[PDB]
From a paper:
Phosphopantetheinyl transferases (PPTases) are essential enzymes involved in primary and secondary metabolite biosynthetic pathways. They catalyze the transfer of the 4ʹ‐phosphopantetheinyl (Ppant) moiety of coenzyme A (CoA) to a strictly conserved serine residue of carrier protein (CP) domains present in fatty acid synthases (FASs), polyketide synthases (PKSs) and non-ribosomal peptide synthetases (NRPSs).
P. aeruginosa has a unique PPTase, PcpS, which was shown to be essential for the growth of the bacteria. In the course of this study, we also resolved the crystal structure of PcpS in the presence of CoA at 2.40 Å resolution. PcpS crystallizes in space group P1 with four molecules in the asymmetric unit. Thus, the crystal structure confirms that PcpS is a monomeric Sfp-like PPTase (Sfp: surfactin phosphopantetheinyl transferase from Bacillus subtilis). Despite low sequence identity, PcpS shares a high degree of structural conservation with the mycobacterial PPTases.
Numbering used by the authors: 0 to 241
């Protein structure tokens, strides 16, 4: 189809990568990712990619424009791959993406790295993806009180002293993914205190526990398995709800 191939990638992004960056694969998901540089962004890249930006992103700063667009390219390519639709999710009033009917996905973008994954809602009701740069030990010791609950600081006291940046970065990433997976289901807003990390292993497997009631099904003590990958000085984590 001739016009859907008029949406070539703007030069500030590397080609959309389909390689799975996580330990365990998930059936029925499509994840695309890119490395971008907000400096290479051109004043006509949005029309080039065929992605209509909302009024907010038109007058935003260059770093935000690049992150939004790069995340929207990955989303459209992931969605195209799953079912063939070159559609971009709108921006909700609650800042969340507005995925098409019977589609659940997630978008993340950090320092020069972006990705998005999508799935049919009949396979995965909720999806939360989040990448975070590895915190330095100092800044991690400064943020450990906000991110880690006192039960987590005790449970992972060893890593808290030895591998400070890894543990805090991870709970940061896992808890943000958990939020992005459950929010389009529960509607409520919960924060770093409302979940705890329970176990994490080098093979990339993790497990979370809810600390408050979010819905009849998502009650206090409900647990969700997650996975994570630590490569390239950044940590990427995934929470998927069947
Ligand atoms: C959504 C949130 C977690 C992302 O913060 P971030 O990880 O620094 O930003 P990321 O780039 O990694 O993810 C950004 C994307 O999240 C998506 N997003 C925003 N709000 C969302 C929501 N309520 N539900 C699902 N996805 C959401 C958006 O698509 C955004 O990309 P866009 O704005 O370019 O479209 C953050 O805005 C937030 O609300 N943090 C507090 C909530 C939290 O941490 N709870 C812990 C629960 S244990």
């Amino acid at each position: 189809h001739m016009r859907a191939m008029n949406d070539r990638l703007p030069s500030f992004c590397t080609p959309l990568d389909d390689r799975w960056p996580l330990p365990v694969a998930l059936p029925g998901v499509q994840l695309r990712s890119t490395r971008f540089d907000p400096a290479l962004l051109q004043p006509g890249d949005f029309a080039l990619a065929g992605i209509q930006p909302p009024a907010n992103i038109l007058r935003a700063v260059a770093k935000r424009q690049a992150e939004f667009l790069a995340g929207r390219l990955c989303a459209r390519a992931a969605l195209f791959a799953l079912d063939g639709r070159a559609q971009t999710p709108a921006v909700g009033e609650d800042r969340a993406p507005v995925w098409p009917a019977a589609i659940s996905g997630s978008i993340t973008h950090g320092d020069r790295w972006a990705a998005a994954l999508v799935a049919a809602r009949g396979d995965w009701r909720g999806l939360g993806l989040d990448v975070e740069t590895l915190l330095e030990a100092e800044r991690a010791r400064y943020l450990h009180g906000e991110i880690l609950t006192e039960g987590e600081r005790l449970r992972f006291a060893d890593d808290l002293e030895r591998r400070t940046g890894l543990l805090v970065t991870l709970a940061f990433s896992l808890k943000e993914s958990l939020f992005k997976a459950l929010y389009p289901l529960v509607g409520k807003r919960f924060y770093f205190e409302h979940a705890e990390l329970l176990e994490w292993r080098a093979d990339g497997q993790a497990r979370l526990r809810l600390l408050t009631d979010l819905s009849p099904e998502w009650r206090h003590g409900s647990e969700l398995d997650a996975q994570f990958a630590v490569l390239d000085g950044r940590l990427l984590s995934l929470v998927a709800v069947g």
